[PDB]
Design a protein around this motif. Structure first.
Motif, PDB file in Angstrom:
ATOM      1  N   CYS A   1       0.914  -1.135   0.052  1.00 40.43           N
ATOM      2  CA  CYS A   1       0.084  -0.069   0.055  1.00 40.43           C
ATOM      3  C   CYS A   1       1.036   1.464   0.147  1.00 40.43           C
ATOM      4  O   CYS A   1       1.890   1.523   0.636  1.00 40.43           O
ATOM      5  N   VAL A   2       0.637   2.018  -0.766  1.00 40.24           N
ATOM      6  CA  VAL A   2       1.462   3.339  -0.630  1.00 40.24           C
ATOM      7  C   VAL A   2       0.498   4.503  -1.373  1.00 40.24           C
ATOM      8  O   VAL A   2      -0.672   4.491  -1.396  1.00 40.24           O
ATOM      9  N   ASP A   3       1.080   5.762  -1.820  1.00 39.15           N
ATOM     10  CA  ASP A   3       0.188   6.899  -2.242  1.00 39.15           C
ATOM     11  C   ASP A   3       0.040   6.756  -3.756  1.00 39.15           C
ATOM     12  O   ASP A   3       0.633   6.193  -4.489  1.00 39.15           O
ATOM     13  N   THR A   4      -0.879   7.397  -4.341  1.00 39.16           N
ATOM     14  CA  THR A   4      -1.102   7.280  -5.630  1.00 39.16           C
ATOM     15  C   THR A   4      -0.734   8.515  -6.412  1.00 39.16           C
ATOM     16  O   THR A   4      -0.142   9.557  -5.709  1.00 39.16           O
ATOM     17  N   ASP A   5      -0.703   8.809  -7.656  1.00 34.25           N
ATOM     18  CA  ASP A   5      -0.356  10.054  -8.348  1.00 34.25           C
ATOM     19  C   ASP A   5      -1.661  10.848  -8.495  1.00 34.25           C
ATOM     20  O   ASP A   5      -2.591  10.680  -9.380  1.00 34.25           O
TER      21      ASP A   5
END
Ligand SMILES: [Ca+2]
Ligand SMILES: [Ca+2]
Length: 82
Positions: free
Chosen positions: A41-45
């Motif tokens: 899981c991480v940040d999107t653009d």
């Protein structure tokens, strides 16, 4: 003791996301601004949508995004132009 395998705390499952330990399973639910790449899981653009600055340009950041309006203004952390 039989610690119900977290499953989401594993280095190959969630990883930087809000999960919910279930009986014999789990759920990698990313926060508002993140996503899931099959498990990590991480940040999107956010800049991938449209220059949030309103006219300047969009940028990718964490928990939101970055934007540089037409030089001469004062943007913000991860909200929009102002
Ligand atoms: Ca579990
Ligand atoms: Ca982002």
């Amino acid at each position: 003791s039989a610690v119900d395998m977290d499953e989401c705390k594993e280095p190959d499952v969630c990883k930087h996301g809000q999960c919910i330990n279930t009986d014999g399973s789990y759920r990698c639910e990313c926060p508002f601004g993140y996503i899931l790449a099959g498990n990590e899981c991480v940040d999107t653009d956010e800049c991938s949508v449209g220059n949030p600055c309103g006219n300047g340009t969009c940028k990718n950041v964490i928990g939101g995004f970055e934007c540089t309006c037409e030089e001469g203004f004062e943007p913000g952390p991860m909200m929009t132009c102002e």
